[PDB]
Subunit: 726 residues, 4 copies
């Protein structure tokens, strides 16, 4: 027996904070977290303990360490069917990755509405607040491969599969409210331009290259989502701390047949929070799995990701009431003009068991709707509807991908479709066609109705000639980017300028950079001049005179577009590094850990080596990581308790820890002799907003630090950071 | 509701004779026939009655008759996800057919041994007479595609999957005891030569073409299995009336570790029976699904196919005691030298529910052995072990083909293999490698032992240099063909001659016919002369003087090599055509039908049209088929009862029915005025052996006809048939 | 050398009547018959005469009769890459057959218009009577698999690929001028009804079974093409002796932008001819490849299929 | 076979040999080469047995394995010399 005597190889099946225990398959970590979808998966879950090792044909294996050979130094024999099965399986493990959003992290949970929405939709999952719908959600980046890094600058995907009693509804959204392009015909062009360039397949996970900006400079429709991608929206702190949006206007249809236009939103109950660019990029090297790890560990801790589903509802008669087209997916609906109605809450409370079986093989498709919802003529949505069925044919091997366990509906499904590769279901129906008499026409069509009825499209009037032509109403490109820009805080605006400046600096052909700055001058002169200055470009007299685009329906700004404008920070689930020394003041540590525990904030005890240190009163404190092993990039704030500061005071890694946190605008707290460190980050003797300091770590020191943490970062510190060499 | 109100759309769930009821899925025809495998398939069986029609995502469909369009005469819209799911699934229904044995028919059943074989093999399925093992068997042809005809001249496959408690064992055999070639390296050449020629893909289901006989003429090792394919072995009456053989010498290993060489046999309990060529060839047009149909309907009628498993056992010390090499798959082991020891019985007693899901996707492979069995160095067997795992990667879409329901073991299977296309099992093991400590090394290897132990290969000694060389002991080609020839009856020999003659007459290049005739002269001068005379070829004096090959270990014949030399007739499950007229003698028909029913022989009542006819006493007689609709090819015998014979006496189809049955050597019985048909087949007044005739169908008439049916055909009629124009 | 000394293994590269010579690949039977498509395929045509037998990696093979073993009666060794490449190729020869029209026979040829049709269409292949367009045509049955018989009762497919200067135009028609159903949404229902029944996969190449007539009796829109199929149109004598039809109304668009509705027809210049049922059904037994053979041999004989 | 779609992956341009390659293998997904050989098997007379095996030799010969001596039982065992 190879497991250690003490059983420390196995994590406890109870919630534990990040790093306390090795992570595990969800059904082992949380065996009593149940929902109807997780329960239906029991028929395919396979255990292991106490079973014999076998071939796939059930034959017990005696020696799993050697090939069959003629003599123990002889040649391997073709009759070794154990070796061949095992190698053949391995040789075929991989399937094609997703064309876009290949990199993603997924979890199970459930959804429940706050009230019946039957006045606006007959969708069964929205019909009663006691209706619980299991979900599986996958969050993703867009551009990079399945093995690229999490904290890149990118749009993020936010796909939710609702397993309803009336079919699977997939809400396949992103973390920004518009897309880059207007018509699906252009999708392969836009995606080719953003993906690694075809000759050499560089760069991975970055839009910072010539072909992306070439396309943007030639297609001004892109500029709105480009603004969002260059803002800190492009670098979220966590998939728990970003918004989601369906982007398209869809329709809700009620039992009376009335259609209401709807745009879908997810509001993060943990608040909105993003990284800063230097932190994000460095973190792609120090932990490329940071967001995947954070999501898994949040759920292991009981810090469940929670989102409120929201609807923007516009009556059919208000179709043409705005100065933009509701069907244009490059336009957002400002919340100031159409508020978001909060309709339900989704809680992700269990990790998968096997990443490939449940996450990699999950198939989400926006065409998967249910009675009570309907599409619109948004021409990007229209083209999506073709792609997500088609792409699964190659990615998941054929047309029976709905029989892969994670994709199966939990409600009944019966029809006349048969065969195809890896057909699981064995149909007993005498008939495989309809109409038929030989099975009395079963399974049978169902008329549309208020509940449990068949799907009928809303009978929208279509009048026009067959054309390949963009609606003139879509031909406005600068007013929403400007609305976005004006709605950001001045620090958010600086981060946008810096995002454009950094990316355009990586464009080798300078005329592309010039053409992009010219586009910025159509949006906002301040933004254009700031970027231009960072690129060594001077705006012409003509560019300085471009008339700003008009306001959006009399809107000057909308603070709901800013990440930070309106306070909504939550500290539960965040993490603080505590930098130890070899003789820590245990009185400090007791107070710190107590205050953090009360607010659900986690801690990581860091030192210059692994093992344990001993506190002044003999308490043994287990070390989680070294200074270099768990960089400040991975935490939200840093606390340095009192004790033997000479032990770390000249530790390069300890000093650098605080300089990096400082640079990235993180709260820092220094107790007693830890205040020696003020010299490394150049803090004046009478203190500075964002640096908590006291004689010791009492309860008043912790409240200050926790208050800074609720504001996320110390934005007032930005003009001081240019000086620090970190 | 489109079913007839009387309920006649639905077959009775009880055994019923062929043609009495529409055929149906196994689980609907025979719901109470169960075995452990059939039960384990319940998790994937899908019903239909009383369910709503849905998409594959579970969304009810309202209108399954129309695409979504703009106006009821307008264009179809891309947003119709219901049409596109349905057509996408149809568009991808087909998977590649099997490279060889693509045409096949399958059933479920069970196996039980007569006694424990613990003394000679530790195989669990052979350990206890009370141990029942479910099986699935597929019978097949070899050359034609899955849409080719059943009653071609070909070898047939007989593949059995035994779902044992210690793993799947697949016994993948043919209906002749040898193969065409000696070394697997030649398999693609041989198969390419027999398959349709590559420029024009002709001929389907036939070896009667140039490239096949070219290869034969150049590779004399093929002659033995060619003799068998040219015999009436190549055209079996049914899958129930052929033998099966695993061909290769394998090993049995007991718990003391002793190896015994074994060849496997299946003996058909229904007896051995074949068609004649003209009948077989015409039947491929009148009913290209004749064997598939006959198998299905036998099982529906309760005439379960039964076979007895037998072993030829040779002690390890006797490996070299024969004139031929035991490892050479072109050599049989005569039952006169090594008798077949009866081992157990297999009964096939339930049809599949869905042919694609269960038959088309079943994967058999002779590498699938269990502890207790092992391989030998037979060089054809050795290459087979490579091919059957490789080919499923494309055929069945990836390395998870064992998770396709029909292929699943019923015993436990656990290992460290993960992922692959279409992965069903969700593994919860923390470890995907061994050795591991994090799951205490589970699942674990199992030492070999007497029951439930791990697989270990028998430690055969290997000694030799690495060579691509045929053993000299394999270099003998003519003695086994001659033993086969000499063992046949004289009418069997005539059919062999006619087989070679017919096939070679299709070879366009005359020199190939000449080269084959030369090979035949090395086997037997009588055979070579008689084929030569049919091809207009004169043997040279050299050919006339070739000395015959030696006997096989002193044997000049072995009657177990003949289909007919030892009577083994069984009438149960056979079928008689009854040719009605419009005023049948009901007394005759009472006597005929009840005598057939008493022996389990089926009848089909035929007439010049469908519907009913009324007997002399008013009994209403339902007609099964017309004389042209169900030709004599499809029955074993023909009875014409008395009545108004002038009604059919002038009917060309009725007369031709008898002439065809007569030419094909079937028993014919004529009652009363039916004897007027004697002039049609040119029977003398005083009658002839093989024609039953009387004033009425009473006394010994039916007993006589049944005695003829038991001898299968009237071989003594062969000289009398050459002159009849039919 | 294995060939006969008289050279009788090799067909004459001249037109010959059916049966006079073994049949052969087109480029060997008629090396001088060319067209722009045929020529373009020269980059991938592979000969054989005078070349060494090799692996797919170009390594010459010394012994293609034996596996590598440890002693001549010993086990086969895994390091035999020659054996495994050859068997791996063979094991993966098959690809899925077509969902419908799996059974089909094809030939190369050329088309040219009798006069310019520029007044009614701007299609380049119809613009000039002296501009030739290569074609590739496949004729087919509908229901049976790729190994089913040719002279079944069925509708026949007649598909033409025109390799034009402005792109490929495929005219994908059948031998009757209508189809069985009105809406594509019903195609899987109809096809499943005509195809072998799903429990036992019977019957092959035949609409003569319950599910097909069940569908017909419940969908009277099928009756028109069913009448066609039950007539002698259902059992053509040869692909050379049937009509073709595009079935649907399409549009022609001229340079001025005017649209004209059009239905397409092929007229067999060999005339229309069918078998009779008893003959057709017996021929599926005696020669299940009869239409495939007849087409190939008409072309080898110079009896080229012509259609207007 | 899964990665590159089937058994014709040596026909993908970067994989192709620059020297001659000829044999009797046929078909497979994505088959590019169009074989004109009347025979797809050997031995054949109909194409005078081309393409033909080549004896091993000093240059341009067929591949023959070195005739290394093999001696021992069929075992799943690590050589003690590896431990
Ligand atoms: C080196 C290749 C090779 C050789 C020498 C053989 N086979 Fe084979 N056989 C195959 C390669 C193969 C295969 C390509 O792997 C098939 C086709 C698809 C499949 O699953 O297995 C197959 C299928 C196949 C089937 C159909 C199984 C089913 O119903 O699915 C039977 C009954 C046999 N074979 C029997 C034999 C016998 C009795 C052989 C000689 C003693 C033999 N085969 C030699
Ligand atoms: C509105 C802009 C769009 C958004 C927000 C969007 C969102 C997404 C998301 C979130 C995923 C990943 C789902 C998962 O987690 O598995 C996805 C995958 C995909 N999308 Fe869309 N998408 C958009 C536009 C398109 C368009 C216009 C097309 C086609 C023209 C498209 C084709 C695909 C394909 C092919 C995949 C891979 C899906 C799979 O392989 O299962 N995307 N997209
Ligand atoms: C109007 C009546 C129809 C005619 C004349 C027609 C014609 C044909 C023909 C001639 C082929 C064979 C092409 C070849 O030689 O390879 C074919 C194949 C096919 N047809 Fe159509 N068809 C018709 C209706 C349809 C409909 C309505 C659908 C779809 C709903 C359809 C789907 C297919 C598919 C999937 C194939 C196989 C193609 C391939 O695998 O390459 N058929 N059809």
């Amino acid at each position: 027996s190879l497991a250690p005597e003490d059983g420390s190889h196995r994590p406890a099946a109870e919630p534990t904070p990040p790093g306390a225990q090795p992570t595990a398959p969800g059904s082992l970590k949380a065996p009593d977290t149940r929902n109807e979808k997780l329960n239906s998966l029991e028929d395919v879950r396979k255990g292991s303990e106490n079973y014999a090792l076998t071939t796939n044909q059930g034959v017990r294996i005696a020696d799993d360490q050697n090939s069959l050979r003629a003599g123990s130094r002889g040649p391997t024999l073709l009759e070794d069917f154990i070796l061949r099965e095992k190698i053949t399986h391995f040789d075929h493990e991989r399937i094609p990755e997703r064309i876009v959003h290949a990199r993603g992290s997924a979890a199970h949970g459930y959804f429940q509405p706050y009230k019946s929405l039957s006045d606006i939709t007959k969708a069964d999952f929205l019909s009663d607040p006691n209706k619980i719908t299991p979900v599986f959600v996958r969050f993703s980046t867009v551009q990079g491969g399945a093995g690229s890094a999490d904290t890149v600058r990118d749009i993020r995907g936010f796909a939710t599969k609702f397993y309803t009693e009336e079919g699977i509804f997939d809400l396949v959204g992103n973390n920004t409210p518009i897309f880059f392009i207007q018509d699906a015909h252009k999708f392969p062009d836009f995606v080719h331009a953003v993906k690694p360039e075809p000759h050499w397949a560089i760069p991975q996970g970055q839009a910072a290259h010539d072909t992306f900006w070439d396309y943007v400079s030639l297609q001004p429709e892109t500029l709105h989502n480009v603004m969002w991608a260059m803002s800190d929206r492009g670098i979220p702190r966590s998939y728990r701390t970003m918004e989601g949006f369906g982007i398209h206007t869809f329709r809700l249809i009620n039992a009376e047949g009335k259609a209401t236009f709807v745009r879908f939103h997810w509001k993060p109950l943990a608040g909105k929070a993003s990284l800063v660019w230097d932190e994000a990029q460095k973190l792609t090297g120090r932990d490329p799995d940071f967001h995947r790890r954070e999501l898994w560990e949040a759920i292991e801790a009981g810090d469940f990701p929670e989102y409120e589903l929201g609807f923007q509802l516009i009556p059919e008669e208000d179709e043409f009431k705005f100065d933009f087209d509701l069907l244009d997916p490059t336009k957002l609906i400002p919340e100031e003009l159409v508020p978001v109605q909060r309709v339900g809450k989704m809680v992700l409370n269990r990790n998968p068991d096997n990443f490939f079986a449940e996450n990699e093989q999950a198939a989400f498709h926006p065409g998967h709707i249910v009675p009570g919802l309907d599409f619109t003529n948004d021409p990007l949505l229209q083209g999506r509807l073709f792609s997500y069925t088609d792409t699964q044919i190659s990615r998941l091997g054929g047309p029976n991908f709905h029989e892969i366990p994670i994709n199966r509906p939990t409600c009944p499904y019966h029809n006349f479709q048969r065969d195809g590769m890896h057909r699981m279901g064995i149909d007993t129906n005498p008939a495989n066609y309809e109409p038929n008499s030989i099975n009395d026409n079963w399974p049978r069509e169902t008329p549309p109705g208020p509940k449990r009825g068949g799907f009928e499209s809303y009978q929208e009037r279509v009048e026009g000639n067959k054309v390949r032509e963009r609606s003139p109403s879509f031909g406005e490109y600068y007013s929403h980017p400007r609305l976005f820009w004006l709605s950001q805080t001045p620090f958010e605006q600086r981060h946008i300028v810096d995002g454009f400046s950094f990316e355009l600096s990586k464009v080798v052909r300078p005329y592309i950079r010039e053409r992009v700055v010219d586009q910025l001058a159509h949006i906002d002169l301040t933004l254009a001049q700031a970027v231009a200055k960072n690129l060594g470009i001077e705006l012409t007299d003509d560019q300085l005179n471009i008339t700003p685009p008009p306001d959006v329906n009399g809107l000057k700004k909308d603070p709901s577009l800013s990440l930070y404008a309106i306070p909504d920070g939550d500290v539960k689930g965040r993490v603080v590094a505590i930098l130890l020394n070899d003789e820590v003041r245990s009185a400090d540590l007791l107070a710190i850990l107590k205050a953090l525990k009360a607010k659900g904030v986690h801690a990581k005890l860091l030192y210059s080596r692994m093992g344990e240190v001993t506190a002044d009163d003999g308490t043994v404190l287990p070390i989680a990581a070294t200074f270099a092993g768990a960089p400040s990039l991975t935490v939200d704030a840093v606390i340095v308790p009192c004790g033997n500061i000479a032990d770390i005071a000249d530790n390069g890694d300890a000093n650098y820890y605080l300089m990096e946190a400082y640079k990235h605008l993180k709260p820092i707290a220094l107790a007693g002799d830890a205040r020696k460190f003020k010299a490394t980050i150049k803090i004046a003797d009478q203190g500075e907003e964002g640096i908590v300091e006291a004689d010791s770590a009492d309860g008043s020191f912790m409240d200050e630090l926790l208050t800074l943490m609720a504001a996320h970062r110390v934005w007032s510190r930005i003009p001081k950071i240019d000086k620090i060499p970190a």
